[PDB]
Symmetry: D2
Amino acid sequence: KHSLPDLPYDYGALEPHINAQIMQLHHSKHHAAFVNNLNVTEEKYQEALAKGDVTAQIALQPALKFNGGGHINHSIFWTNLSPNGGGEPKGELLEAIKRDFGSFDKFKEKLTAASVGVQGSGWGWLGFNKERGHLQIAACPNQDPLQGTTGLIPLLGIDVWEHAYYLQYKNVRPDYLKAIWNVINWENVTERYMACKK
Amino acid sequence: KHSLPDLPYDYGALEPHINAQIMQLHHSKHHAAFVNNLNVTEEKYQEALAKGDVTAQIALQPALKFNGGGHINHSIFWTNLSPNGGGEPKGELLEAIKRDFGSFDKFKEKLTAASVGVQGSGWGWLGFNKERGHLQIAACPNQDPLQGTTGLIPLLGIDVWEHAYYLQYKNVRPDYLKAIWNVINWENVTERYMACKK
Amino acid sequence: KHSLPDLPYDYGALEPHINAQIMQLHHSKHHAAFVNNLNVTEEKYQEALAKGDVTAQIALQPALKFNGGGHINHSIFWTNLSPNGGGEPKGELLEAIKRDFGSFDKFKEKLTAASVGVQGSGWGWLGFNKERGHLQIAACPNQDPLQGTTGLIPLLGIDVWEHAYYLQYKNVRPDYLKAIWNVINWENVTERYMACKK
Amino acid sequence: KHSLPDLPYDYGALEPHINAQIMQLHHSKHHAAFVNNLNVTEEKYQEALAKGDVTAQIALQPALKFNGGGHINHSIFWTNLSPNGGGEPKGELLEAIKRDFGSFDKFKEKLTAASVGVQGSGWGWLGFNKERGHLQIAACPNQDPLQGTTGLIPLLGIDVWEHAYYLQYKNVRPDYLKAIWNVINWENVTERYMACKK
Ligand SMILES: [Mn+2]
Ligand SMILES: [Mn+2]
Ligand SMILES: [Mn+2]
Ligand SMILES: [Mn+2]
């Protein structure tokens, strides 16, 4: 049975970049609901599965992808954020970024562009491409999770659902993106990255 | 050249159901941006078309559908609301609703469910199916407009992008849906309906 | 564990409308593979499910929908075809068709159009809409099954994957559609329909 | 006005790998139809654009992408094949393949897997990622063209619509993929590659 992870920190710990109200709603309402609906959906899917009811199995897919994906994505996102965050990565991950994108600031420009470019709801990602052995930026619609839908390993996600920023930044997604760089947990991203070098 | 239509009322006219801050942002920022991007995309498409640049044309399609759709949808939406609206429609539209959905209450439930059910950004619609000669509810993703993507003539739209409600209703989409019924302009919906009597 | 249904008839029994070669390949190769891959995929899904591996669950969805859907769709399609088929339905189903589409020939025109209009692979369907209580035509992409993805109950399906006709009709899908009316099992469609009137 | 390009060789030139009946149908029927529908759709779009009919424009998008994409893709495909092709590419393209995929064999496996893996109609592509300055494999659905929908410059395409192989290889897509390697025009693929050296 899945459950809602606690944050590594207090709801106000990312101010002023992400205010407390958004963090509270985002965690305790949006993510909580994903977990609840995921549990429901998985239980329904097992019943369908046991019965070899393929029509029901297929009818359950939108809910599983949306809620399952929301659970995966948000779980990663809190670990990707930290009051102790911001600045620049160092060591191999910084070397990898320079190698694959030219430099850190070119990387930021590219992930910003992928995130601002989502028309509708979705996520921008820095991922790791296992078969190519290098970093890769991708954007995902709605709650479609990166690994499940692209095969890429998620390292850093930027939520660009309106609920992630609207109470603070209103319609100006690029101010949100500028501010979020101050709370990125590069320690976590580096752990995710080093886990890929196996 | 497309233009941003004025609202048929002041930004505060739909209080307390939809507050003034949302109406002002929704019209002055979101819709405004759709209009300019639509105009720019149309001019780019003319150039691509004049050179027979098929790749350019296809690459422009997402911006044309998103911004053109956005302009269509919001232009309809403002006319679908009124400070003087609410309650039940009068005349033939109510009888069509009873014929096709069983009753007004049943219809409201269906349109509400279609709207609350969008798993991402989008719109709920009451449409007219000209081929079948009856009403039809449908949901559309992002800014994909009803007529251009499904053929159905839009009668009433409910915006369920988060920007349509978040500042007031936070994550609670059903509270927004319950409130909006108080400001439906049935005169406008009837006008749109009668124009389908074909 | 799912399995491949035997046809109600011999591979050559729909000649000259659908030749034996297509029926043999279509059943013993295309459908067989759907069943095989569906079984594999369901077994993998249970393992994922037991483990609460949502990323794997989501990664399995394309295969389940495609192969599961291919199993659902083809299973229905053979029952929808018969050497004993063709002509016109009678009784309530014919009455329903006249009611909802004007007449049988208007219905044929509409299902033909939905089937010929698929750009790519897919299916045209006559379905039953439970909540509206009437017939409904819809088209589905690839092997996306009607009930699983639209909620409509399938009554009659027309396969418009190229493998359904190419060896005989080559690129001319409209000759295929004209010919298939001669082998439709209206007895079966009527059973499916009457099962919906509950 | 777009035109149907002549093949750079006779319909039988690619025997026995792709037979003459397929080449003749593929070019004279499938591609021919894409060209006329593209031209007609472009003229319709000009009219819609000139009137500011956004709904009309959006309604034309599926035909423009499908027929325009079809024209793009097949125009590339014919040039990607040769009676004089096969074997391994010479020069820098082979070294780029080794750099990006590990070796030619590995590349062939990846492109084969991307192609055989399309769950419906579509195309497998070897592309160039101008932003990353390296090769990239991708699959596209239906006739969605590579550059206009992903940004990647097409170098080599493999058609995996059933019409590309069915008359010869029946359902066995892998046998078609194994054969087509015998007729790849690496001179053309190299030309396309060198043009990306940007
Ligand atoms: Mn979120
Ligand atoms: Mn809106
Ligand atoms: Mn089939
Ligand atoms: Mn083709």
